[PDB]
Design a protein around this ligand. Structure first.
Ligand SMILES: C[C@]12CCC(=O)C=C1CC[C@@H]1[C@@H]2CC[C@]2(C)C(=O)CC[C@@H]12
Ligand SMILES: C[C@]12CCC(=O)C=C1CC[C@@H]1[C@@H]2CC[C@]2(C)C(=O)CC[C@@H]12
Lengths: 125, 125
């Protein structure tokens, strides 16, 4: 059932739902036993309630999220480059990760990983 | 020993060595028991001689390779977006993958994976 069209649309749904603070929209993309590792290197969060809590915490500030290149999607995986921008105490920050999703054959995301380091966090003083 | 500076420089060495057709330059970046999976979804090539044969075959046409965004590097992994351009029988093709490297603590690449689908291969008739 899964295709590169479908996985690319899921990435686009995900970006829009982070913009909308549509915490439900995001969680419905995931399989019930999916993991989230964000950032790469940190402890994976596992299962629906943990994935929702991760995103709810991610969304306490309004996020402006945009894809900055075409999605790459093949087999049952997709990767994408994008930015997440926010303002706090009058400092604007732009974070530029590359994320990877793996899908199951039902078209749900079974794992996300978000790869970004300190040189990918762009902010003035 | 490994750092995000080092992994970012390794990505830059890799891109330059594909441009130069410096097949040796590329192979020296890899650990002796490293794997290459390009594209994602295909059979991994394993060990020095298999990795060299993969790249030697990749390099029969001159490649023009360029990073198109900053490298993302954290922990012991890096991912990067870039293009590989070539001409054959007067058709120019631009392929736009996202690649991922994992490193060992010696700073060598233990696995590459290259993620690109048919919608990431840009070519006229
Ligand atoms: C979770 C997240 C959005 C969803 C995504 O898919 C990948 C990222 C990584 C960047 C995170 C961001 C959440 C907001 C974060 C935590 C910040 O305030 C600084 C880093 C940025
Ligand atoms: C192996 C490679 C360069 C090294 C890299 O790191 C990732 C890629 C994927 C795109 C490959 C390219 C090799 C040349 C290829 C096979 C073509 O002629 C069309 C697709 C393109």
């Amino acid at each position: 059932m899964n295709t590169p069209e479908h996985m690319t649309a899921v990435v686009q749904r995900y970006v829009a739902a982070l913009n909308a603070g549509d915490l439900d929209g995001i969680v419905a993309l995931f399989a019930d036993d999916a993991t989230v590792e964000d950032p790469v290197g940190s402890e994976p969060r596992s299962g629906t309630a943990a994935i929702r809590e991760f995103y709810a915490n991610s969304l306490k500030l309004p996020l402006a999220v945009e894809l900055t290149q075409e999605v790459r999607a093949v087999a049952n995986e997709a990767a994408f480059a994008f930015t997440v921008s926010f303002e706090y105490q009058g400092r604007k920050t732009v974070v530029a990760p590359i994320n990877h999703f793996r899908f199951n054959g039902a078209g749900k995301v079974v794992s996300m990983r978000a790869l970004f380091g300190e040189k990918n966090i762009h902010a003035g003083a």
